[PDB]
Amino acid sequence: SRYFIEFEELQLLGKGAFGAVIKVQNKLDGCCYAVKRIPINPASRQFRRIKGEVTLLSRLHHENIVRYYNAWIENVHYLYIQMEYCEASTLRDTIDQGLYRDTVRLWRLFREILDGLAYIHEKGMIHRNLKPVNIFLDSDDHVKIGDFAALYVSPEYNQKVDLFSLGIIFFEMSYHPMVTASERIFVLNQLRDPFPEDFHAKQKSVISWLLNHDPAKRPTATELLKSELLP
Ligand SMILES: Cn1c(Nc2ccc(C(F)(F)F)cc2)nc2cc(Oc3cc(NC(=O)C4CC4)ncn3)ccc21
């Protein structure tokens, strides 16, 4: 319907149970967007659940959160969510391209993830799914948090599970690309406990704080910005 008429599909960005995310181009305004396509039944319990994401995103306005544009339902079957398309890399790709050498950049991008966490936490939300493929960089190199592997998830509920994820993400941002999985799995599992040898005093302090098993002993996003471990 509307989607096949008004847009041209460009690239599949992601595929799962959640449905699909497709990079599209609006034929009229000529811009690129990131559109989430979710299968749906009208007037259902699961419908009212997923529409919740739409009413959430339509009220987020932060420079470090993926902009919302529109949401609609087509033939019964499908819910489409139209969001800004961030042109540059995923944080994932940015990290693997040697982000770790670029410390002034690395601390800006961290502080930008934190500003995005604090905003959505102040609005009552929990992300639940923060990880490097769900963080985006725009054409000015600014962080934008989105959402469409067990190693980003808190052992344990509450908002501080996002700050555990962030601790894993920030370690990866601060360290060299781990090209093999078995290296990733080893180094990351040894941040969960009661750190690799080629490790950065202030980086280390921040991560240890965020990787506390007990969420009560982790900081809030606003706590950490106000902490003097950043500059
Ligand atoms: C509907 N929807 C959501 N939901 C959502 C939920 C919660 C929050 C929270 F922060 F508040 F929790 C934020 C957003 N996230 C989406 C991300 C989407 O994909 C992209 C892709 C790109 N670019 C690239 O992939 C190029 C190739 C590297 N840029 C922006 N968005 C598409 C739809 C999304």
Curated annotation (Swiss-Prot):
Residues binding ATP, per UniProt: 13-21, 36
Domain of life of the source: Eukaryota
Tissue expression remark: Widely expressed. Expressed in lung, smooth muscle cells and macrophages.
Residue numbers annotated as active site: 129 (proton acceptor)
Recorded family membership: Belongs to the protein kinase superfamily. Ser/Thr protein kinase family. GCN2 subfamily.
Comment on protein domains: The histidyl-tRNA synthetase-like region and protein kinase domains are necessary for eIF-2-alpha kinase activity and eIF-2-alpha-mediated translational control. The histidyl-tRNA synthetase-like domain is necessary for binding to uncharged tRNAs. Kinase domain 1 is a degenerate kinase domain.
Clinical condition linked: Pulmonary venoocclusive disease 2, autosomal recessive: A disease characterized by widespread fibrous obstruction and intimal thickening of septal veins and preseptal venules, a low diffusing capacity for carbon monoxide, occult alveolar hemorrhage, and nodular ground-glass opacities, septal lines and lymph node enlargement showed by high-resolution computed tomography of the chest. It is frequently associated with pulmonary capillary dilatation and proliferation, and is a rare and devastating cause of pulmonary hypertension.
Function: Metabolic-stress sensing protein kinase that phosphorylates the alpha subunit of eukaryotic translation initiation factor 2 (EIF2S1/eIF-2-alpha) in response to low amino acid availability. Plays a role as an activator of the integrated stress response (ISR) required for adaptation to amino acid starvation.
Protein name according to UniProt: eIF-2-alpha kinase GCN2
From-to range in the entire protein, with total length: 584 to 1002 of 1649
